[PDB]
Design a protein around this ligand. Structure first.
Ligand SMILES: Nc1ncnc2c1ncn2[C@@H]1O[C@H](COP(=O)(O)OP(=O)(O)OP(=O)(O)O)[C@@H](O)[C@H]1O
Ligand SMILES: Nc1ncnc2c1ncn2[C@@H]1O[C@H](COP(=O)(O)O)[C@@H](O)[C@H]1O
Ligand SMILES: [Mg+2]
Length: 566
């Protein structure tokens, strides 16, 4: 009886302990991967780290099964287990993530249905932290008592990175000028530094994240440590702006790889810098993706209970395969695969689902948005707008089940809500339009350089962020770059003896679409003409196959030290 309820509760908790343990054993390898520039490893780590959590929830559920099987499928029994599990939390440093794990297990057990607040931690059970004193620092303070050249030499001479610096003084002085031109000699000496103990690794970079304490108030202080074609460590640029920081930790970049024995602590410190990020967003930034899903559902529930607006179909051009809706004042959209696709389409829901999975664990490169897959998402009929309820019933009838006052959508994705780039290009003008086309062209370029070929490059498949960045979001259109045949001469039209086969792509036909509006055409020819040349694309897939891995700067290129300062 009791003993069993306890074993279960404890095997679930032992499960979380083990998964987080494994999770950071992986993370700790980031330094070595970067130190030996093993770029291909860095990416496999991103995939293995992402699967860990589900792997363990898997093991734990199997155990839970053998351990009983008869009771696992029993809601009365699990009510007790939750009871005990909850009494094990007051101790655990990572209790919040411990709750998510319990939920994950609960869900696998009941195939994601009947999720009441009494059966799982949809809410928390624990009092809000509101931090005391971290058991151990997590960040060090640096005062310029001879500082700036001394302060910096001291911090640069603290990184555990085992490679040679290709002229520190050089980089160290670049940093000084920036601060100087930014704070003014006076306050620069009134201001100090507080840099996090751990480096945030991502791709071919090792990030330093600290706080610039100005008498004006605290500010972001980030230094992207890069490495030369032959192992030289150098600091490329320095960002002390909140907006800048928001991009570096943007939702369209792969999560950072930062060693964090106590996540909640790290998250809270982070709020200071980039204060526009919500709780889930901060977790997601440092890698706790599954836990952020838990927090996302909470922020959703909060916003929902506090608004008298109904769910309506997302603004823009309706799609051939997905049905996407949103709440007026909410910063996300829901996307569901439609029962049947438009005649012009010949792919399976399975393939669509595969693409979303493909990009989730991909080097998102800052151009593809993170998404959250939800099984059996529940909505309250009285919340769905009449126009939308009929769309769902007509387009996704198979994916929705009635429950009287509420409906259940079986599968769906949730992602950052942006404004469809096709709408932006019709709202913006002048400089703002140039910035969009450049931003758009560079999106294609970077996706391409990371073995991702957008399927349909039409504006309607891209979105514009709060910062005016163009991010791709129509994932089932995608295919790997080393999997498409680029061609020079386009097939005749007379708007087929000229045989074209699956995989063929004619970069010159792009002119026709991407340049039909006289407003933007010229802008393309000026900033992105290369995109119409099949030679350009083939060169790109050559470096891919050659195993090359292009660099990505989470900032404007004209901010790189080697650009502005000589
Ligand atoms: N992240 C988003 N933010 C804002 N609107 C979005 C977002 N994602 C999709 N939409 C809305 O839905 C439309 C895009 O639907 P979408 O392109 O994703 O279906 P689909 O992707 O075309 O099917 P397929 O992938 O096979 O091309 C846009 O018109 C846009 O208004
Ligand atoms: N259908 C759902 N409705 C509401 N929350 C969910 C749903 N599915 C999963 N979650 C939440 O997301 C976390 C589980 O993610 P997962 O393990 O992939 O099922 C849990 O902490 C749950 O609170
Ligand atoms: Mg589309």
């Amino acid at each position: 009886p009791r003993g069993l309820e306890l074993l279960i509760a404890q095997t679930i908790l032992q499960g979380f302990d083990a998964q987080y343990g494994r999770f950071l054993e992986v993370t700790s390898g980031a330094q070595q991967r970067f130190e030996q520039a093993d770029w291909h490893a860095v990416q496999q780590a991103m995939k293995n780290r992402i699967h860990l959590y589900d792997h363990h929830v898997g093991l734990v559920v199997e155990q839970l099964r053998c351990i009983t099987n008869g009771q696992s499928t029993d809601a009365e029994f699990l009510l007790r287990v939750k009871e005990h599990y909850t009494r094990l939390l007051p101790d655990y440093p990572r209790f919040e993530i411990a709750e998510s794990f319990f939920n994950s297990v609960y869900c696998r057990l009941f195939d994601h249905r009947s999720l009441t607040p009494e059966r799982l931690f949809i809410f928390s059970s624990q009092p809000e932290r509101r931090f005391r004193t971290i058991p151990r620092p997590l960040a060090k303070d640096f005062h310029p008592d001879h500082g700036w050249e001394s302060l910096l030499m001291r911090v640069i001479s603290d990184l555990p990175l085992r490679l040679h610096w290709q002229n520190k003084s050089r980089d160290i002085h670049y940093i000084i000028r920036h601060l100087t031109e930014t704070l003014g000699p006076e306050n620069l000496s009134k201001s100090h530094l507080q840099v996090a103990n751990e480096l945030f690794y991502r791709n071919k970079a090792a990030w330093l994240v600290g706080k610039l304490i100005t008498p004006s108030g605290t500010l972001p202080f980030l230094l992207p440590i890069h490495q030369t074609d032959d192992g030289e460590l150098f600091i490329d640029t320095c960002l002390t702006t909140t907006a800048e920081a928001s991009i570096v930790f943007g939702f369209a970049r792969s999560y950072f790889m930062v060693y964090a024995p106590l996540p909640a602590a790290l998250v809270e410190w982070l709020r200071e810098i980039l204060p526009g990020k919500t709780t889930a967003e901060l977790y997601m930034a440092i890698g706790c993706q599954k836990h952020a899903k838990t927090e996302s559902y909470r922020e959703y529930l909060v916003y929902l209970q506090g608004c008298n607006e109904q769910f309506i179909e997302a603004p823009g051009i309706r799609g051939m395969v997905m049905l996407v809706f949103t709440l007026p004042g909410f910063d996300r959209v829901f996307k569901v695969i439609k029962d049947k696709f438009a005649p012009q389409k010949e792919m399976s829901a399975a393939h669509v689902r595969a693409c979303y999975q493909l990009v989730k664990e991909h080097d998102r490169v800052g151009r593809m948005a993170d998404t959250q897959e939800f099984e059996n998402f529940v909505l309250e009929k009285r919340h769905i707008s009449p126009a939308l309820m009929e769309l769902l019933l007509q387009e996704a009838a198979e994916k929705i089940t009635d429950l009287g006052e509420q409906i259940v959508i079986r599968h769906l994705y949730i992602e950052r809500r942006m404004v469809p780039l096709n709408i932006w290009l019709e709202q913006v003008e002048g400089q703002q339009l140039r910035d969009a086309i450049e931003e758009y062209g560079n999106a294609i370029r970077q996706l391409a350089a990371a073995n991702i070929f957008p399927g349909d490059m039409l504006f309607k498949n891209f979105g514009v962020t709060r910062h005016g960045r163009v991010v791709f979001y129509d994932y089932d259109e995608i295919c790997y770059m080393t999997e498409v045949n680029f061609r020079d001469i386009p097939p005749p039209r007379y708007p087929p003896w000229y045989s074209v086969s699956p995989g063929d792509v004619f970069p010159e036909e792009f002119r026709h679409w991407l340049c039909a509006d006289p407003r933007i055409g010229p802008l393309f020819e000026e900033m992105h003409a290369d995109l119409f040349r099949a030679d350009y694309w083939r060169a790109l897939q050559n470096r891919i196959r050659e195993g090359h891995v292009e660099d990505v700067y989470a900032y404007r290129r004209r901010q790189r030290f080697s650009v502005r300062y000589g």
